[PDB]
């Protein structure tokens, strides 16, 4: 059982290659997750210069195997059950009245490090809009992440609506559609319907000259 890999603190590496309206960029990240607390801490650097999109729009792309599954729900932690071999995470993210991100990720162990490698593609964004015009506040809210099994794909289907606070007091919704399928052929837990209560907080390293993001996530499963 993959649950075993998560009983202590696990180091994490993150790598993302992106292209939004033709603007290419790369990000690298490191930190650690502790599933016993449901805690994740990560720092990201844009290695190509300036990030062409707002940092909060990439938060959900930048490892739900670090959720805390209460003991009575351990039967439904598909994320852990897929490791070490790992799992594919794909999303399409529809920004209300704007463009969309499509993403492709693999989350897996390489020895003692959990690795999350992402490709991201965004298109049809307005040059005046909240995203390309950098009108999102640098902050994040709480959301519920709804998980249901997908028996035919041997995986899960996931959906939620992220609320991005805009600097003029409006809110920009980002509608997430998500699926996850194992990478190995080992058996995986297909869960009953449930959700992950997700909270996050963004901040900055003042000793960091490069464009960057410090990310903190707290995630606990619920609904059973």
């Amino acid at each position: 059982k993959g649950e075993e890999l998560f009983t202590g603190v696990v180091p994490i590496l993150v790598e993302l290659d992106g292209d939004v309206n033709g603007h290419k960029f790369s990000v690298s990240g490191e930190g650690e997750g502790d599933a016993t607390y449901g805690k994740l801490t990560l720092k990201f650097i844009c290695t190509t210069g300036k990030l062409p999109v707002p940092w909060p729009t990439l938060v959900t792309t930048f490892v739900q195997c670090f959720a805390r599954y209460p003991d009575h729900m351990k039967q439904h932690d598909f994320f852990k059950s897929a490791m070490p071999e790992g799992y594919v995470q794909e999303r399409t993210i529809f920004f209300k009245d704007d463009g969309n991100y499509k993403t492709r990720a693999e989350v897996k162990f390489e020895g003692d490090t959990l690795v999350n490698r992402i490709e991201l593609k965004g298109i049809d964004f307005k040059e005046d809009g909240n995203i390309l015009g950098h009108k999102l506040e640098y902050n994040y809210n709480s959301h519920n992440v709804y998980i249901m099994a997908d028996k035919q794909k041997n995986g899960i289907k996931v959906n939620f609506k992220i609320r991005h606070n805009i600097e003029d007091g409006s809110v920009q919704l980002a509608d997430h559609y998500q699926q996850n399928t194992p990478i190995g052929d080992g058996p995986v837990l297909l869960p009953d319907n449930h959700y992950l209560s997700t909270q996050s907080a963004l901040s900055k390293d003042p000793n960091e000259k490069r464009d960057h993001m410090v990310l903190l996530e707290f995630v606990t499963a619920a609904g059973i």
């Epitope: 590496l13 070490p84 693999e106 390489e110 020895g111 003692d112 490090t113 990478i183």
Partner: nanobody
Amino acid sequence: SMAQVQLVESGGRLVQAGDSLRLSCAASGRTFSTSAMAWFRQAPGREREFVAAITWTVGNTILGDSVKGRFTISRDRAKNTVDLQMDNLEPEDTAVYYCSARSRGYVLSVLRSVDSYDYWGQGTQVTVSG
């Protein structure tokens, strides 16, 4: 969207004991998913034997006991190659050298085992004469 990866070894030669040689492997296909690559070697009448492995993201390396301090594995993610630098070659290094790759994630201990890889090249011959 295909998982298939293809591996092409090169560089095997006939060489004198105490010489060095560099082998190279080229991966293509869904290289995005690669998580480890490795070199094994097989001599006639013998089981295939672990030589060296390298984790793909970080570059952590594992060497088989009988090449420790002589062989060096390294990989280049931009070119999707993994090279095996063999110094101080001995007649007993004579074998066909195979390149392999894994895409599933793993704990480190399974990487020495032939059964832990999803893709294999067709080998390149190394002969060491003394």
